Amino acid sequence: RFPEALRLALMLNDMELVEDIFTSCKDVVVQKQMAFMLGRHGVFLELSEDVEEYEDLTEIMSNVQLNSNFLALARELDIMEPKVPDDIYKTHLENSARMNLASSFVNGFVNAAFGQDKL
Amino acid sequence: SYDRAITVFSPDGHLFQVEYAQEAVKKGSTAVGVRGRDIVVLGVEKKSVAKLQDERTVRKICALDDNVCMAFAGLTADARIVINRARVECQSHRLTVEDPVTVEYITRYIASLKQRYTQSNGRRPFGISALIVGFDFDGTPRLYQTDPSGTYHAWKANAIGRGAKSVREFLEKNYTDEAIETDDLTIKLVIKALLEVVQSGGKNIELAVMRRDQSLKILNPEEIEKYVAEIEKEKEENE
Amino acid sequence: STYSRQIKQVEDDIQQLLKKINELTGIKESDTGLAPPALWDLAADKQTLQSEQPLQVARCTKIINADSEDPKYIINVKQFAKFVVDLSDQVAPTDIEEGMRVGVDRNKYQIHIPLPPKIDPTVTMMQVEEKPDVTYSDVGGCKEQIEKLREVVETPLLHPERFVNLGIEPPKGVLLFGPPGTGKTLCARAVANRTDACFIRVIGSELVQKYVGEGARMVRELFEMARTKKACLIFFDEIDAIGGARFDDGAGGDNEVQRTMLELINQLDGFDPRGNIKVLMATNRPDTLDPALMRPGRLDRKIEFSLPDLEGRTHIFKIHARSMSVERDIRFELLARLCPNSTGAEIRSVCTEAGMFAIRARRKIATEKDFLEAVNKVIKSYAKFSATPRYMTYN
Amino acid sequence: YDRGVNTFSPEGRLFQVEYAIEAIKLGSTAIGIQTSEGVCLAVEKRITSPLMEPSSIEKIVEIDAHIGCAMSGLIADAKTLIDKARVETQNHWFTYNETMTVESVTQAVSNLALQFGEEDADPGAMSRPFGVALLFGGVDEKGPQLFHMDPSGTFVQCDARAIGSASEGAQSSLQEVYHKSMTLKEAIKSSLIILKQVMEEKLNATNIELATVQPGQNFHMFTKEELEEVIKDI
Numbered sequence: 001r002f003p004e005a006l007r008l009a010l011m012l013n014d015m016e017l018v019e020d021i022f023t024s025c026k027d028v029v030v031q032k033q034m035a036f037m038l039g040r041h042g043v044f045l046e047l048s049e050d051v052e053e054y055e056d057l058t059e060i061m062s063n064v065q066l067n068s069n070f071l072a073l074a075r076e077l078d079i080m081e082p083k084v085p086d087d088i089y090k091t092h093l094e095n096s097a098r099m100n101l102a103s104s105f106v107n108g109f110v111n112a113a114f115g116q117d118k119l
Numbered sequence: 120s121y122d123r124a125i126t127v128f129s130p131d132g133h134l135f136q137v138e139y140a141q142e143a144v145k146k147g148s149t150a151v152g153v154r155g156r157d158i159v160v161l162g163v164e165k166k167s168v169a170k171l172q173d174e175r176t177v178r179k180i181c182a183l184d185d186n187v188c189m190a191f192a193g194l195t196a197d198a199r200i201v202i203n204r205a206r207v208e209c210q211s212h213r214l215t216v217e218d219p220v221t222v223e224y225i226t227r228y229i230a231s232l233k234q235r236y237t238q239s240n241g242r243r244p245f246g247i248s249a250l251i252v253g254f255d256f257d258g259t260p261r262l263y264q265t266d267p268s269g270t271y272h273a274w275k276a277n278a279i280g281r282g283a284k285s286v287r288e289f290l291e292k293n294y295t296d297e298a299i300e301t302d303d304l305t306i307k308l309v310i311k312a313l314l315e316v317v318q319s320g321g322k323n324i325e326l327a328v329m330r331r332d333q334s335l336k337i338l339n340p341e342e343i344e345k346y347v348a349e350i351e352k353e354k355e356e357n358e
Numbered sequence: 359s360t361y362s363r364q365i366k367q368v369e370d371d372i373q374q375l376l377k378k379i380n381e382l383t384g385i386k387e388s389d390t391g392l393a394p395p396a397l398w399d400l401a402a403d404k405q406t407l408q409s410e411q412p413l414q415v416a417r418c419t420k421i422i423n424a425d426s427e428d429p430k431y432i433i434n435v436k437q438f439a440k441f442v443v444d445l446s447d448q449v450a451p452t453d454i455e456e457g458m459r460v461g462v463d464r465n466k467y468q469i470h471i472p473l474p475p476k477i478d479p480t481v482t483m484m485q486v487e488e489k490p491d492v493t494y495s496d497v498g499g500c501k502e503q504i505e506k507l508r509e510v511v512e513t514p515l516l517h518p519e520r521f522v523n524l525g526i527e528p529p530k531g532v533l534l535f536g537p538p539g540t541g542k543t544l545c546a547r548a549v550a551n552r553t554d555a556c557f558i559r560v561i562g563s564e565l566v567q568k569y570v571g572e573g574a575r576m577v578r579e580l581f582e583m584a585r586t587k588k589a590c591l592i593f594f595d596e597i598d599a600i601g602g603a604r605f606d607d608g609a610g611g612d613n614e615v616q617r618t619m620l621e622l623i624n625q626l627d628g629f630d631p632r633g634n635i636k637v638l639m640a641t642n643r644p645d646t647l648d649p650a651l652m653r654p655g656r657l658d659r660k661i662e663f664s665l666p667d668l669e670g671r672t673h674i675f676k677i678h679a680r681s682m683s684v685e686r687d688i689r690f691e692l693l694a695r696l697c698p699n700s701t702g703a704e705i706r707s708v709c710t711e712a713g714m715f716a717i718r719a720r721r722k723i724a725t726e727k728d729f730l731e732a733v734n735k736v737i738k739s740y741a742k743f744s745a746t747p748r749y750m751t752y753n
Numbered sequence: 754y755d756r757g758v759n760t761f762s763p764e765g766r767l768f769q770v771e772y773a774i775e776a777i778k779l780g781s782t783a784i785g786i787q788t789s790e791g792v793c794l795a796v797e798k799r800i801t802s803p804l805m806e807p808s809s810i811e812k813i814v815e816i817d818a819h820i821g822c823a824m825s826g827l828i829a830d831a832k833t834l835i836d837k838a839r840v841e842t843q844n845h846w847f848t849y850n851e852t853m854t855v856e857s858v859t860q861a862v863s864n865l866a867l868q869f870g871e872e873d874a875d876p877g878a879m880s881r882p883f884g885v886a887l888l889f890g891g892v893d894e895k896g897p898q899l900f901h902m903d904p905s906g907t908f909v910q911c912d913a914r915a916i917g918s919a920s921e922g923a924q925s926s927l928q929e930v931y932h933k934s935m936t937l938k939e940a941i942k943s944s945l946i947i948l949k950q951v952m953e954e955k956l957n958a959t960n961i962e963l964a965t966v967q968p969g970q971n972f973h974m975f976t977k978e979e980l981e982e983v984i985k986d987i
């Protein structure tokens with residue numbers, strides 16, 4: 001049960017055990033899923049070029065495809081439209097340097113990792 | 120003359136008067152018809168059998184002709200009119216064609232009359248469904264069912280009335296070629312189907328058979344009791 | 359079982375510890391409305407009790423000599439009395455107007471603070487504070503109806519800039535009508551869930567009151583408190599309770615309800631502008647509504663929630679059977695074909711009864727046969743009690 | 754209720770006519786196809802019990818030796834229209850020694866629709882529209898011809914028309930699969946394919962009716978063996 005073993009070793013922060021678990025498995029797909037888990041956890045491994053499917057495994061562990069996957073999700077979840085801080089403030093329902101700085105922070109937070117903004 | 124459209128289309132697309140007539144049928148006594156090999160059997164649940172009631176007069180199985188007889192379920196008075204009209208037309212067809220009517224012909228006339236009463240001004244639909252059994256001129260047994268709407272179908276075995284659904288479910292399971300090998304087995308199947316709904320037993324079963332080249336024969340209560348005894352005996356050996 | 363003795367020992371220790379903690383901290387009373395002691399600012403409470411004097415609520419009646427430097431204000435202190443007072447030094451003269459509620463002191467009754475207008479608590483509770491759990495994704499077969507409803511009740515509030523630029527005045531009223539179970543209140547709940555402005559739900563039966571003129575008073579106060587917001591939505595569910603057409607039957611047949619309906623009509627489109635209120639009414643008997651209520655400017659859009667077609671019924675079946683543990687080959691198109699004129703409620707009941715048939719047989723997955731039996735039980739067997747055939751004559 | 758049978762809605766609809774049109778959607782699906790090689794009519798029997806005899810469910814009817822009809826909806830209502838079609842035909846033959854046009858038969862049947870009323874009507878006049886939809890298919894001087902009739906009396910020639918419960922999906926499939934120059938065998942196969950995907954039950958040679966009216970040949974109801982021959986493919 002390689003994926004849960006890798007999770008358990010990550011709970012142990014035993015880098016040697018992470019490497020041993022990753023290179024012990026012979027299944028390429030299981031190694032890809034484990035690479036996804038490692039990339040999410042922020043743990044990276046320097047695989048050997050002799051290891052089969054080194055390229056895609058390294059790309060998965062480096063989260064280089066994270067941006068494209070996130071954008072594909074957002075396109076599927078039809079939320080690609082940028083949001084102005086006014087749509088969050090909703091001042092039309094309410095019966096400065098600091099204000100502008102706060103609004104820039106809101107614009108950054110709301111549209112984080114989307115790549116598009118109206119502002 | 121009263122000219123009012125009693126039967127009109129509901130906005131849903133239904134003829135509500137026809138459905139109410141079918142409900143009146145569903146409030147009637149269970150009548151079961153089984154088409155065997157050389158016999159056709161009609162068994163009607165007698166509802167409640169009062170000891171002061173002249174059982175001859177209250178009969179839900181009536182012979183339309185020498186080769187055709189039907190058992191109804193629904194409003195008795197409407198059924199009497201339908202039976203009388205069918206008998207008159209049977210005699211007219213015998214006069215014209217010089218041949219006894221086929222089961223299809225009398226069934227079609229009854230259904231057409233019912234449909235006419237579901238589409239005529241001032242007339243409510245007949246509140247009876249009929250099970251018409253008989254033999255054609257070639258000796259083929261035939262069983263047909265007509266409903267207040269005016270649609271008729273041929274059935275190997277069928278049931279109408281309050282217990283129609285359960286009896287039809289039972290007949291779908293026990294109507295086989297083996298079960299209709301002999302006349303006795305066919306009558307036993309009819310009695311079993313009636314016993315699925317009849318509570319007391321053979322006392323509330325009026326059974327009448329018709330054999331090829333023979334007239335309708337009403338089974339006496341002792342015969343039905345003997346058949347029920349046979350079924351009860353056969354029940355034990357299957358346990 | 360080996361740990362049971364230690365389990366009970368530590369559990370009793372925990373209970374004793376919790377009681378001991380509650381001994382020092384608080385958590386008691388709760389019948390006299392006492393907050394937990396962690397929120398007790400007792401010094402500030404004493405300072406408020408001393409410095410902050412109580413103020414009796416009165417109503418200003420007339421301002422004498424408003425032009426000069428000595429304006430006298432006639433106030434009507436509720437059931438107490440009537441006085442001629444002057445404003446306190448901390449209130450601007452232009453902040454008090456005739457007919458508005460004020461708050462005055464108990465010694466000289468000088469006006470100390472202008473107050474919001476009085477609103478009936480029953481009217482106040484009519485505004486929605488918890489949005490429903492229904493989105494527009496839960497309404498199937500009503501694409502055009504939902505679009506027409508949204509472009510009146512949601513789009514002008516969300517993006518008003520698209521309307522002011524072209525000199526466009528969007529409709530300010532929508533009447534959802536259709537047979538029962540077709541989704542009028544479902545769409546209203548979806549609107550209330552998606553809306554950001556103040557949403558007020560009014561049931562017509564709530565506008566029926568014991569006394570004469572009280573229903574009109576509730577309508578007036580409802581539109582008064584709806585006008586205290588920049589944008590507002592009022593939902594009138596079952597408007598046929600009070601929206602019936604005016605008639606004269608010799609006696610006083612429905613005179614008071616007709617007066618309530620007339621007050622609602624006057625608020626919708628009368629001498630005074632309505633405001634930014636966008637009303638919304640749902641009824642299964644639109645034929646009974648008054649012609650003046652069914653008029654543009656009061657009910658500008660009339661969205662019909664007719665029974666779903668084949669595609670709409672299939673969409674509703676997909677919506678309600680989404681979380682079902684159905685089989686792999688459920689022919690939902692066939693099921694939609696098997697119930698020609700059926701409301702969405704009947705489709706939901708068909709899904710629920712198919713699940714119930716599967717549960718009764720102790721099965722964790724509902725087959726297509728279960729859905730067929732559900733259609734037979736709901737669409738066919740229950741068709742005697744169907745509200746559809748009678749109610750499409752009314753719509 | 755308060756409304757009469759001959760009442761107009763504010764939208765200009767005859768109320769009882771629309772309500773009878775709604776009755777067809779509860780009927781069984783029928784599909785008619787007209788091709789240069791002939792007219793193919795198909796219908797689903799919709800057997801509700803193994804005990805019911807399929808042969809008694811007659812939903813495709815010989816109007817005349819060159820004309821057949823497939824009915825959907827209230828089958829009992831269709832009997833009067835069928836009888837009037839079969840009596841009106843052979844009356845044209847009686848007076849003119851020729852078979853009627855399919856269009857003429859459909860028009861004569863259409864004239865029966867809307868002949869209902871409450872007051873100022875004959876004792877034999879009907880009280881409600883015929884809650885049935887008819888598909889006439891025949892061969893005449895204009896070759897093969899298929900006409901669709903609905904309870905409003907509006908009859909119209911159709912290249913390929915599907916009526917009944919699955920009229921929408923079957924019509925969409927017919928539009929997808931119909932081309933003007935195709936054989937009668939292709940028409941039969943396509944109609945059977947469309948029926949098979951819309952039946953509640955499983956398609957076999959017992960729960961469907963197939964008939965063909967070809968030029969030269971007469972109206973022909975497909976037997977069980979002929980049905981199994983074409984069903985064995987799909």
Ligand SMILES: Nc1ncnc2c1ncn2[C@@H]1O[C@H](COP(=O)(O)OP(=O)(O)OP(=O)(O)O)[C@@H](O)[C@H]1O
Nearest residue numbers: 496497498538539540541542543544642674702703
């Ligand atoms: N178009 C629809 N799509 C999905 N579900 C629907 C639809 N219409 C009705 N339903 C379901 O049926 C239920 C019927 O309740 P609903 O509040 O929508 O009825 P209504 O139209 O307001 O009826 P009434 O006129 O009796 O007040 C809904 O709660 C919902 O679950």
Ligand SMILES: [Mg+2]
Nearest residue numbers: 542543544640
């Ligand atoms: Mg509602």
